[PDB]
């Protein structure tokens, strides 16, 4: 909460760039890949 929260949030949004450019090199819809990759990572945890 407060100020130093928005920073972390936009930091977590940044790290997501590696999977994006990984997928965009593969010619995939990087948005579709990540939305589904985060969704599967909210359950099946550390392997997706």
């Amino acid at each position: 909460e407060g100020v130093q929260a928005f920073i972390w949030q936009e930091f977590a949004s940044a790290l997501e760039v590696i999977p994006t450019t990984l997928a965009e090199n593969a010619g995939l819809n990087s948005i579709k890949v990540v939305t589904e990759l985060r969704s599967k990572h909210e359950n099946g945890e550390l392997n997706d």
Binding site: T20, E24, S30, I31
Partner: protein
Amino acid sequence: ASALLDQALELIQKGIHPIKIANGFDEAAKLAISKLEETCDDISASNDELFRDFLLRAAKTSL
């Protein structure tokens, strides 16, 4: 316009097609003007004493 071009930019580096964004903006512009219309106050339902005031209030604003 510039922030809209900036908001597009971030979404492009994400890997999204521009035309689908531009389309995605216009249907999102049509929902903004629609809420404004349904919510905007009106000076037509006014008497003569209160219409010449609202016109001053806008004059004030712009100045």
